[PDB]
Design a protein around this ligand. Structure first.
Ligand SMILES: [Mg+2]
Length: 182
């Protein structure tokens, strides 16, 4: 971030439990809000788009309860962001991108969620989450309810790895760090 310079990319590429450990040591408030996130990263208000990313990003990392960063929530991201196994991540992707506490999904809530995540990137790239969501909905209808069960997510992945690869491909460290710096 914006502190004592120090290589950012390398830190992220080496990032381990030091960040997670650092958080606990700095203060066990229980949960860190957006300001706390911005505290670690430089550029308080680089752009409106950056704000959407944190908004969408917190929502995607919230996967737990509140919209704030809760204990274990950071380490979880760190634990998954690490090499590990791609297939394992996919499963990690499932617990998220859905209503808090997991459960079934439907058209509406998943749309705004994809809107924020696509909010951080889209347009020219045409790689928005919303656009992908529209395509996935087609030919994946289960019932009149229109709701999608963990089966749909797994089924979509099974039918193709384009989305599964995208979710895995989307996550990164330096790409995120470099984008913030601008
Ligand atoms: Mg949360």
């Amino acid at each position: 971030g914006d502190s004592s310079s120090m290589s950012a990319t390398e830190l992220s590429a080496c990032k381990c439990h030091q960040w997670y450990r650092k958080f606990m040591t700095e203060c066990p408030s229980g949960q860190l809000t957006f300001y706390e996130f911005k505290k670690f990263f430089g550029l308080k208000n680089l752009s409106e788009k950056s704000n959407a990313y944190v908004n969408t990003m917190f929502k995607t990392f919230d996967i737990d309860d509140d919209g704030c960063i809760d204990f274990m929530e950071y380490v979880a991201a760190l634990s998954l962001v690490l090499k590990g196994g791609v297939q394992q991540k996919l499963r990690w992707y499932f617990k998220l991108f859905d209503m808090d506490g997991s459960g079934c999904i439907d058209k509406d809530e998943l749309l705004l969620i994809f809107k924020a995540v696509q909010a951080i990137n889209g347009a020219e790239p045409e790689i928005s989450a919303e656009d992908l969501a529209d395509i996935v909905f087609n030919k994946i209808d289960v019932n009149g309810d229109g709701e999608l069960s963990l089966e749909e997510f797994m089924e979509g992945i099974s039918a193709d790895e384009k989305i599964s690869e995208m979710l895995t491909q989307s996550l990164d460290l330096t790409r995120i760090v470099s984008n913030i710096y601008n």
